[PDB]
Write a protein that binds this ligand. Structure first.
Ligand SMILES: [Mg+2]
Ligand SMILES: [Mg+2]
Ligand SMILES: [Mg+2]
Ligand SMILES: [Mg+2]
Ligand SMILES: [Mg+2]
Ligand SMILES: [Mg+2]
Ligand SMILES: [Mg+2]
Ligand SMILES: [Mg+2]
Ligand SMILES: [Mg+2]
Ligand SMILES: [Mg+2]
Ligand SMILES: [Mg+2]
Ligand SMILES: [Mg+2]
Ligand SMILES: [Mg+2]
Ligand SMILES: [Mg+2]
Ligand SMILES: [Mg+2]
Ligand SMILES: [Mg+2]
Ligand SMILES: [Mg+2]
Ligand SMILES: [Mg+2]
Ligand SMILES: [Mg+2]
Ligand SMILES: [Mg+2]
Ligand SMILES: [Mg+2]
Ligand SMILES: [Mg+2]
Ligand SMILES: [Mg+2]
Ligand SMILES: [Mg+2]
Ligand SMILES: [Mg+2]
Ligand SMILES: [Mg+2]
Ligand SMILES: [Mg+2]
Ligand SMILES: [Mg+2]
Ligand SMILES: [Mg+2]
Ligand SMILES: [Mg+2]
Ligand SMILES: [Mg+2]
Ligand SMILES: [Mg+2]
Ligand SMILES: [Mg+2]
Ligand SMILES: [Mg+2]
Ligand SMILES: [Mg+2]
Ligand SMILES: [Mg+2]
Ligand SMILES: [Mg+2]
Ligand SMILES: [Mg+2]
Ligand SMILES: [Mg+2]
Ligand SMILES: [Mg+2]
Ligand SMILES: [Mg+2]
Ligand SMILES: [Mg+2]
Ligand SMILES: [Mg+2]
Ligand SMILES: [Mg+2]
Ligand SMILES: [Mg+2]
Ligand SMILES: [Mg+2]
Ligand SMILES: [Mg+2]
Ligand SMILES: [Mg+2]
Ligand SMILES: [Mg+2]
Ligand SMILES: [Mg+2]
Ligand SMILES: [Mg+2]
Ligand SMILES: [Mg+2]
Ligand SMILES: [Mg+2]
Ligand SMILES: [Mg+2]
Ligand SMILES: [Mg+2]
Ligand SMILES: [Mg+2]
Ligand SMILES: [Mg+2]
Ligand SMILES: [Mg+2]
Ligand SMILES: [Mg+2]
Ligand SMILES: [Mg+2]
Ligand SMILES: [Mg+2]
Ligand SMILES: [Mg+2]
Ligand SMILES: [Mg+2]
Ligand SMILES: [Mg+2]
Ligand SMILES: [Mg+2]
Ligand SMILES: [Mg+2]
Ligand SMILES: [Mg+2]
Ligand SMILES: [Mg+2]
Ligand SMILES: [Mg+2]
Ligand SMILES: [Mg+2]
Ligand SMILES: [Mg+2]
Lengths: 148, 185, 53, 51, 156, 222
RNA sequence: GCCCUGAAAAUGGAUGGCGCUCAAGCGUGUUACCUAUACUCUACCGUCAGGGUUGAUAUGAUGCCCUGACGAGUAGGCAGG
RNA sequence: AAAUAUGUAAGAAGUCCUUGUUACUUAAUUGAACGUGGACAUUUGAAUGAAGAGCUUUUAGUGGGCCAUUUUUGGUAAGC
RNA sequence: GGAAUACUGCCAGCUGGGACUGAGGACUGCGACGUAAGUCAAGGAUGCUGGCAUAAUGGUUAUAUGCCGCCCGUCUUGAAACACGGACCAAGGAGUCUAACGUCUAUGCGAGUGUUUGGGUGUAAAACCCAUACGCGUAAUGAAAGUGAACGUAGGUUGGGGCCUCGCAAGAGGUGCACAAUCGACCGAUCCUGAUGUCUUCGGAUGGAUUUGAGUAAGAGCAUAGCUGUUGGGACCCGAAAG
RNA sequence: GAAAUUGUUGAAAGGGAAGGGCAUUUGAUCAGACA
């Protein structure tokens, strides 16, 4: 609010905390990103290296969502099972009746493997997997079932 | 006059109260100011300062960071003190028993904790259960995992992540970032 | 100085304690008596102005 | 609350330094030094009165 | 409310003093002040009156008299610091003066007791004064500085 | 709960013990002091007897006074005036003498007066203007208990025990000395005896080493 | 060495002024004396700092009490009002 | 070949003893580096001082300067 | 020959005059004197006496007097300036709001978080409720096709608050979060290596390298608010010559 | 029904401006406190 503001404090001081020598004028650097390559270049390299020029291929009419593919790590995985339902499967860990997890149905695209899931067998359904994501699953005796 | 060797009227620059304005915090602090004056025990002095600490300096301790500190050799029965909030960590499966004593337990946290027959304890309860802080384990959150520090230290050859909105190629990735566009950082 | 130290350190431990092995700045000198035997003070006085050139 | 000089204020004089009594008691501050009559060598005088 | 009242007030419970250490010890008089001595009154009612010193009173005041009959000044109190002690001295070994105390001058015309007291002391003094000639006249005369006097030089 | 006079006795009775110690102490320093003073006097004669000259040892202790104001001072002396704790005018501290302090003094000569202090002036400095540095603070001495409190660590449990440690430049002189807050003297009461202060002593000014003549000054300023 | 000559500019005019000649001038010595927002001691204000004290059954816990040091200020910052 | 000025050192991150690791290195279990085990405490290795040290983030004003002693360039000089 | 004196210095030797101050407010401390009971000048003034009880003391004000004192604002190395504005008085009169942001802080919840596009509802622009989605975060890295984070107690070493054990204490050991230093491990890019195999040109295991990334290594984010700061806007307020 | 600014009346000061600071005389004026 206006009353906590420092301009209230400055009232009675000529220069408004702007200095007498070098004033407060309109635009001295220029407006905007002016002089990027010239009188403000020192700032732009450091603070902003890479800013100028060009790299890589142009993509006309890229539609995002073409490339939709959210990642879920093994890291969680078990998260996708409701906590009550959950414990029931961890204990009693066998083939014959192992949980199915439609990770697409969660809303994930690929399963990466950030590591360590208990030795419980699980049937994991996904569109995509890391080479290790699988191995790890398989070491618990789960499998990966590819869907779309 | 005096050749001053040192700046005059310097403030110590350490907090003295919480900058908080919450009574309950104000009260806990009442406790430990008392407790730290009159009990020559270091743990109380430490705890008292930690209450003055501000949110940044109180990064969350997770229940999984807790379980690890009990996996500490010979440290499985001590009671973890956290002068901040405790958060749940879905990534650990077999969290242990013990006693966590904190300011705040997120719902998932306190759940996980009691689900294995633990106990969640407000610090004033911790106080009465153990004045001289006997048998405590104080844990601290990772202060420097804040996103803000990524950008601290920025400059050339520093490896430090621009302050940048919309990112991708086409966003500060050309001249000054690669030997084939002028130069590299 | 160290291996110097480490010696008189043991040499005086195996003796009877009493070490002292920090260096010390030059101390102002002590009293002393100067004899006149064979050495009476030779009085000198300032000289007058000359040139030789 | 108020520093008191010793040097004047015999009270605090005696509060520090219990010796000040006996010192004063035995006029120690005016000890009459014992008298010896050693005479200086003629070297010393000749050269004192030299040119 | 016009004003919003404090959240605190002073206790009106007045403290007692600290147990001060200040003995009223007896005032020893300057050496020139020996009974029998003629004083000069530097001030007050009988300013510049030359006057005989009689006794040191327990309230530090001086007991003097004129004698009354000589110069009009009666048995009286006088502060020792408003007085010039001279060098001239009558003998007060025959004047009783032990009667005279502080209460003797308690405020509470002239009480005839005084008028009697005053005759008795004086009669003793004039006996002595008559001994040294011109004293009586001395006493009768007022002291004043004349052009030229430097008290910081004058012997009294 | 006794203590009424019980532990009140178990202190005072033991308060006496500690004065006793001091009394036997102080009494003995005297013997030391004079019969060393006396010792030189007869040394000086005994050599005169032999025709030989007796040169007494270089002084070991000096007493320094910042004699110059605060401003327009060059950096290197400015530091040394700090390191010697003379950071304001007419304040004085004791300096143990070795080369590695001598050179300091050297460097600050045109800003200080200093010389060799008698026991008399050390005694009167400490008595009237002695203060201890105790958690900063600067506490007046005025009761020997204060000294024992902080300096007792090294022997030293009386104001005279302090003084003996100074004047004789003791083994614990660092601790002893530093324990005293830089004395704060007034200006001299006569004056400086010079028309102009900031020349050397030897040139009729006030600064530099003026040897035993420091006692006349400090005393005027005390 | 002091003094004198060498030694000429414009409104009337400056050892600061009056005036001073065994000086009230020059060189030097000895004392005393005068007085800065400085120094020493003390009170009071404020700033920073270190202690103590939640024990009810009366009145501020940001409080109450003890103690020490310090205080110049444009541009400029912050704070309490 | 000075004076002033100026780099480094004055210990626990120190000094020794015993003998593992390697793809480097050696004629070589030779050496280099990094270790394991052991021996010696504050006269633990000069002085003085220290209202403590260390570290982090953000932001103002400023980016016409001038003067003095000493060093000193141009200029006959200059309040250049 | 034997003195004296000067001079310099010492005394916890005695002693006079004068000036300013009197903070504190039960007790408590260190002492001193006493054979003693006591006493005291020892952790900050008390005793006695008098005067007015008033304009006496004190404030305010005008004037006189001693000393001192230039016009403020501004730009400037430098202004009282022979630099500029200002004859006088009242009333107006200049760092704002907004979009998006950096640091800091407070608060809510926390691997999440954000009810307010909308719906439901109401004592109707409020308050109360809420489905689906969305945004930001929870993964990085390459120009890209793409690939994607545990050798190990999520590592070794050093410092490390705190806690634990021994000890009366000093000390010794144990464990050590944050943080800091250093050596490594894992993921992508780059380069090398190219096992088992194959629709004989596909496949890319495995083990590496003075390379490299805004990475991993038991999550810290999301949202509201505020001071200060950033950009764009009439952008602190008043000003061109022009187009 | 403010100010600038003006008339009157009362008081006061004024040898080439006025106003200001510390201090006290004098005049005018006023509080508080005594009990
Ligand atoms: Mg407002
Ligand atoms: Mg704002
Ligand atoms: Mg305000
Ligand atoms: Mg301000
Ligand atoms: Mg203001
Ligand atoms: Mg300003
Ligand atoms: Mg203005
Ligand atoms: Mg500003
Ligand atoms: Mg301006
Ligand atoms: Mg400029
Ligand atoms: Mg661009
Ligand atoms: Mg991608
Ligand atoms: Mg993850
Ligand atoms: Mg990110
Ligand atoms: Mg992250
Ligand atoms: Mg008494
Ligand atoms: Mg007397
Ligand atoms: Mg008559
Ligand atoms: Mg010193
Ligand atoms: Mg004198
Ligand atoms: Mg004088
Ligand atoms: Mg004199
Ligand atoms: Mg002169
Ligand atoms: Mg003095
Ligand atoms: Mg002339
Ligand atoms: Mg003159
Ligand atoms: Mg002369
Ligand atoms: Mg004279
Ligand atoms: Mg003053
Ligand atoms: Mg200031
Ligand atoms: Mg300052
Ligand atoms: Mg050097
Ligand atoms: Mg250096
Ligand atoms: Mg050192
Ligand atoms: Mg020190
Ligand atoms: Mg310190
Ligand atoms: Mg800056
Ligand atoms: Mg800047
Ligand atoms: Mg700049
Ligand atoms: Mg200068
Ligand atoms: Mg009082
Ligand atoms: Mg008082
Ligand atoms: Mg009245
Ligand atoms: Mg009257
Ligand atoms: Mg008038
Ligand atoms: Mg006036
Ligand atoms: Mg003037
Ligand atoms: Mg201007
Ligand atoms: Mg100009
Ligand atoms: Mg101006
Ligand atoms: Mg001009
Ligand atoms: Mg202009
Ligand atoms: Mg004008
Ligand atoms: Mg207005
Ligand atoms: Mg409506
Ligand atoms: Mg509802
Ligand atoms: Mg719906
Ligand atoms: Mg996202
Ligand atoms: Mg490929
Ligand atoms: Mg290692
Ligand atoms: Mg340890
Ligand atoms: Mg270890
Ligand atoms: Mg790699
Ligand atoms: Mg690359
Ligand atoms: Mg990124
Ligand atoms: Mg802008
Ligand atoms: Mg316009
Ligand atoms: Mg136009
Ligand atoms: Mg155009
Ligand atoms: Mg009208
Ligand atoms: Mg006045």
């Amino acid at each position: 609010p206006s009353r906590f503001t420092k301009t209230r404090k400055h009232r009675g001081h000529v220069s408004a905390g702007k200095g007498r020598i070098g004033k407060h004028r309109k635009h001295p650097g220029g407006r905007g990103m002016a002089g990027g390559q010239h009188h403000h270049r020192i700032n732009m390299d450091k603070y902003h290296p890479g800013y100028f020029g060009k790299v890589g291929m142009r993509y006309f009419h890229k539609q995002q969502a073409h490339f939709w593919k959210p990642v879920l790590n093994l890291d969680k995985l078990w998260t996708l099972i409701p906590e009550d339902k959950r414990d029931q499967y961890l204990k009693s860990a066998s083939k014959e009746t192992a949980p199915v997890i439609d990770t697409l149905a969660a809303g994930y695209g690929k399963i990466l493997g950030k590591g360590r899931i208990p030795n419980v067998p699980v049937i994991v359904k996904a569109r995509f997997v890391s080479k290790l994501a699988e191995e790890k699953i398989r070491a618990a005796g789960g499998v990966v079932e590819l869907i779309a | 006059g005096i050749d001053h060797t040192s700046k005059q009227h310097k403030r110590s620059g350490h907090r003295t109260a919480p900058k908080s304005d919450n009574v309950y915090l104000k009260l806990l602090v009442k406790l430990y100011t008392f407790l730290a004056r009159r009990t020559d025990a270091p743990f109380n002095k430490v705890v008292l300062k930690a209450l003055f600490l501000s949110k940044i300096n109180r990064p969350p301790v997770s229940v999984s960071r807790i379980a690890r500190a009990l996996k500490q050799e010979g440290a499985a029965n001590k009671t973890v003190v956290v002068v901040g909030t405790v958060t749940d960590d879905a990534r650990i499966f077999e969290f242990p028993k013990t006693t966590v004593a904190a300011l705040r337990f997120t719902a998932g946290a306190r759940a996980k904790i009691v689900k294995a027959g633990g106990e969640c304890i407000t610090l004033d309860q911790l106080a009465v259960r153990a004045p001289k802080g006997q048998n405590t384990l104080i844990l601290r959150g990772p202060r420097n995992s804040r996103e803000a520090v990524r950008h601290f230290g920025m400059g050339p050859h520093k490896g430090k992540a621009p302050r940048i909105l919309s990112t991708g190629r086409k966003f500060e990735r050309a001249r000054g970032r690669r030997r084939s566009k002028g130069f590299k950082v | 100085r160290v291996k110097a130290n480490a010696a008189k350190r043991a040499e005086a431990k195996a003796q009877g304690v009493a070490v002292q092995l920090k260096r010390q700045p030059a101390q102002p000198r002590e009293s002393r008596i100067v004899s006149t035997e064979g050495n009476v003070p030779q009085t000198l006085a300032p000289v007058p102005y000359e040139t030789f050139i | 609350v108020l520093k008191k000089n010793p040097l004047k204020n015999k009270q605090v004089l005696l509060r520090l330094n219990p010796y000040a009594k006996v010192f004063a008691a035995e006029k120690l501050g005016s000890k009459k030094a014992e008298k010896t009559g050693t005479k200086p060598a003629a070297v010393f005088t000749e050269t004192l009165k030299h040119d | 409310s016009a004003q919003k009242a404090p959240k605190w007030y002073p206790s009106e419970d007045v403290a007692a003093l600290k147990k001060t250490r200040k003995a009223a010890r007896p005032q020893k008089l300057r050496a020139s002040l020996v009974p029998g001595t003629v004083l000069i009154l530097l001030a007050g009612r009988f300013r510049g009156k030359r006057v005989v010193y009689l006794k040191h009173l327990e309230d530090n005041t001086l007991l003097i008299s004129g004698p009354f009959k000589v110069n009009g000044v009666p048995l009286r109190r006088v502060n020792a610091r408003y007085v010039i002690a001279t060098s001239t001295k009558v003998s007060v070994e025959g004047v009783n003066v032990e009667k005279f105390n502080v209460e003797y001058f308690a405020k509470e015309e002239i009480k005839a007791e005084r008028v009697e007291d005053q005759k008795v002391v004086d009669k003793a003094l004039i006996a002595e004064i008559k001994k040294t000639p011109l004293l009586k006249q001395y006493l009768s005369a007022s002291f004043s500085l004349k052009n030229g006097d430097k008290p910081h030089m004058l012997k009294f | 709960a006794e203590q009424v006079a019980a532990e009140r006795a178990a202190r005072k009775a033991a308060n006496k013990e500690k004065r006793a110690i001091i009394l036997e102490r102080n009494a003995a320093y005297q013997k030391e002091y004079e019969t060393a003073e006396r010792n030189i006097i007869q040394a000086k004669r005994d050599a005169k007897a032999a025709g030989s000259y007796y040169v007494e040892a270089q002084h070991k202790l000096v007493f320094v006074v910042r004699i110059k104001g605060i401003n327009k001072i060059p950096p290197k002396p400015r530091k040394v005036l700090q390191l010697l704790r003379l950071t304001r005018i007419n304040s004085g501290t004791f300096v143990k003498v070795t080369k590695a302090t001598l050179e300091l003094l050297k460097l600050i000569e045109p800003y200080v007066a200093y010389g060799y202090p008698s026991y008399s002036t050390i005694r009167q400095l400490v008595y009237k203007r002695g203060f201890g540095k105790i958690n900063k603070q600067r506490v007046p001495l005025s009761d020997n208990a204060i000294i024992e409190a902080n300096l007792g660590k090294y022997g030293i449990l009386s104001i005279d025990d302090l003084i003996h440690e100074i004047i004789t430049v003791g083994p614990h002189f660092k601790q002893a000395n530093n324990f005293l807050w830089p004395f704060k003297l007034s200006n001299p009461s006569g004056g400086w005896g010079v028309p102009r202060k900031f020349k050397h002593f030897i040139q009729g000014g006030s600064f530099g080493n003026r040897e035993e003549f420091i006692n006349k000054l400090v005393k005027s300023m005390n």
